[PDB]
């Protein structure tokens, strides 16, 4: 049975990989300049200069929503965009330093991205198993990593089983300055998550997405 389980995990991992594209697009210098602006965002949030729904604080992780943000609404799936104008606009530097570079290297089309979420993790931070809500966001899902090298996990059923019973279907290395593009199986047909032990130093990720025109709002 365990041999079968193992072969099955390998097969699923192949399928996950089919929907993953990665590249290193930001040099150490570009990363440093972007990292300084991420620190500016954190500073302005701590000064209380953003709207309430822009900033979501948790013990080992903060989220900063720009352009569009979402939350669980009263109950498609339950996630809902905030009302228009509730979250702060995407900062110019995200357009100029990050998105424009992605467009230049043909990762996404011009005018695709209208949502930018900055996730800032301290060592030990955790994200629950999830699929990016398909009734909110079009594919592909793009993420850009900063401050340190880490890992993104796919197939996250292990989160709900005892330690030593299960493991991620795929652990994907995500290096500082790398761009990760999720489509097909990887974005639609399996969960992803982050494990505390994989965050060894501060890690930040800029998640760049397109909201559906018909995405429901609160
Ligand atoms: Mn996600």
Residue numbers in the entry: 70 to 144, 150 to 292
Give the article text.
Following crystallization trials with various 2OG oxygenase inhibitors, we obtained crystals of ALKBH5 in the presence of Mn(II) and IOX3. As observed in other 2OG oxygenase structures, the conserved DSBH core fold of ALKBH5 consists of eight anti-parallel β-strands βI–VIII (β6–13), which form two β-sheets: the major β-sheet (strands β6, 8, 11 and 13) and the minor β-sheet (strands β7, 9, 10, 12). The DSBH acts as the scaffold for the three Fe(II)-ligating residues His204, Asp206 and His266. Mn(II) is observed bound in the Fe(II) binding site, and the 2OG binding pocket is positioned in a cavity between the two β-sheets of the DSBH with the more open end of the cavity apparently providing substrate access to the active site, a feature common to all 2OG-dependent oxygenases. The active site openings of both Chains A and B are buried at the interface between the two chains in the asymmetric unit. The βIV–V loop, which is known to be involved in substrate binding in other 2OG oxygenases, is apparently constrained by a disulfide bond between Cys230 of the βIV-V loop and Cys267 of DSBH strand βVII and by interactions with the N-terminal helix α1. Modification of Cys200 was observed in electron density maps. Subsequent refinement led to assignment of the modification as arising from the reaction of IOX3 with the Cys200 side chain with the loss of chlorine. Two molecules of the covalently bound IOX3 derivative, each attached to different ALKBH5 molecules at Cys200, are observed to be in proximity (<3.5 Å) with their aromatic bicyclic rings stacked against one another, presumably aiding crystal packing and formation. The observed NRL (residues 124–161) of ALKBH5 comprises mixed β and loop secondary structure forming two β-hairpin-like loops: NRL1 (residues 124–137, strands β2–3) and NRL2 (residues 138–161, strands β4–5).
